[PDB]
Structures are given as C-alpha cells and as structure tokens.
Amino acid sequence: MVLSEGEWQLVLHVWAKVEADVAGHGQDILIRLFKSHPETLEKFDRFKHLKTEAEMKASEDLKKHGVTVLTALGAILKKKGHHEAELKPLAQSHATKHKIPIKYLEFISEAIIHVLHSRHPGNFGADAQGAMNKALELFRKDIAAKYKELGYQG
Ligand code: HEM
Numbered sequence: 001m002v003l004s005e006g007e008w009q010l011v012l013h014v015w016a017k018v019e020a021d022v023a024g025h026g027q028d029i030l031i032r033l034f035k036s037h038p039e040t041l042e043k044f045d046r047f048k049h050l051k052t053e054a055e056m057k058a059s060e061d062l063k064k065h066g067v068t069v070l071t072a073l074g075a076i077l078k079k080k081g082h083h084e085a086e087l088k089p090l091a092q093s094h095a096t097k098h099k100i101p102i103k104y105l106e107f108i109s110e111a112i113i114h115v116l117h118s119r120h121p122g123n124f125g126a127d128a129q130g131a132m133n134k135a136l137e138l139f140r141k142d143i144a145a146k147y148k149e150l151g152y153q154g
Pocket of ligand 1: 069100
C-alpha cells in the first residue's frame, strides 16, 4: 500500500514523542504484548522465565531489548516506505532464527497502537492512529513478502 506524506508526518510526529523516552515506551509495549498474548513470550528464550508484570518491569535486559526493538522500528518508519535495506536483516532473523509468525507481528502492532493511544492522545487522535496503522500494515505486508522469499510461511 502507499502512505501519503501527510500520513507519514502523523506517524513521525507521534514517534517524536516516543523518542523522549524510548526505554519506557518499549517496556510498556513489550509488557502489553506479553500480557495480551502470553504465547508470544514463549518465543523469547531469554525472557520467558518472567512470571509477572513486576518482574518484567524490573528486568534491565528486557528494557534494553525494548530499546533495540523500537529503535529498529523507528529507523524503518523514518524511511517512509523505502525500507528494503532495513527489512532484510530483520526478516531473516525473525523468519529463520526466532520463527515469528505474521500473526505475532500483528499482535505487537496492536500493542504499539494501544500504548501510543494511552500515552499520547495529543498526537494520536483517530487520523494519527489510522496513519500509524497504515505504516504498520505496510511493514507487515513487506515483511511477509520477504518471509516468503526466505522460505518461511509466517
Ligand atoms: C515491530 C516488530 C519488531 C521489530 C522491529 C523487532 C526487532 C528486533 C530486533 C532489532 C532484534 C535484535 C536483532 C535481531 O535478532 O533481529 C529482535 C530480536 C528478537 N525478536 Fe523482534 N522485533 C519485532 C517483533 C517481534 C515479535 C512480535 C516477536 C515475538 C513474538 C519477536 C521476537 C524476537 C526474539 C525472540 C528476538 C531475540 C531476543 C534476544 O536477544 O533474546 N520480535 N527483534
């Protein structure tokens, strides 16, 4: 699909707020993912021992991983759709090593939208949320096509 420049600017204006504190946003998004869809935590051999939200919040390693994840996504979003180079390594690791189905990328997209809706109503009204959804749908479309090329059904 293709986003307009106006849609990308709605995406990037909320991402600017995420970047005030990427670590805290990443904690909220990964915890939301794990609480809403507990099966996703089982894909993380390093983190699946965490039993409760308190343990997740206290995990320095989970915090650092959330920064890694949201910084990678932010670099993709800043490409405004021209993200082929960024998707190659991410698709290869997520298809082949981590084995993350497209359904689970849908779940993390839902968690991202949920947390931005909660934290950022000033920059995440209905039009801005639709633009973010379109950007995440494009990310998932393009990663699913790369999954197929790499041999993984997703
Ligand atoms: C917005 C979507 C996502 C982004 C941008 C993203 C990004 C990343 C990055 C940058 C890494 C480290 C380098 C690499 O291994 O590729 C990583 C690792 C990983 N990702 Fe993701 N990821 C996403 C979604 C998911 C989802 C939904 C799952 C699981 C349900 C997942 C599971 C993993 C695992 C298991 C690792 C390894 C963690 C470790 O170091 O122990 N990823 N991800």
